[PDB]
């Protein structure tokens, strides 16, 4: 017949470096446009307030 009585102490030092990257997107609004345009008059009379 035996009887074992025990005790423990403990430390722990945990250092962590986390890198993360995320790319969100919406399928309805993927792109935005921009046009570079000029206006040409090949006619004979001038035209005003051109839209």
Partner 1 sequence: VKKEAAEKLLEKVPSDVLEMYKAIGGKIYIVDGDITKHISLEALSEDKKKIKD
In degrees, rounded to 5, the angle at the alpha carbon of residue 49 between the alpha carbons of residues 45 and 51 is 100
Rounded to a whole number of angstroms, the minimum distance from the CB of residue 26 to partner 1 is 9
Q: Is 27 in the site for partner 1 (CB under 8 A)?
A: no
Q: Which of 2, 27, 41, 44 binds partner 1 (CB under 8 A)?
A: 2
Site string for partner 1, 5-24 (x = CB under 8 A): -x-x-x--------------
Cβ within 8 Å of residue 50, ≥6 positions away: 39
- From the list 47, 31, 28, the residue with the least C-alpha distance to 39 is 47
Min separation Cβ 27 and partner 1, Å: 15
């Amino acid at each position: 017949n035996s009887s074992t009585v025990a005790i423990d102490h403990s430390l722990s030092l945990a250092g962590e470096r986390t890198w993360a990257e995320t790319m969100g997107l919406n399928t309805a609004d993927t792109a935005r446009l921009n046009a570079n345009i000029r206006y040409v008059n090949t006619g004979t009379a001038p035209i005003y307030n051109v839209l």
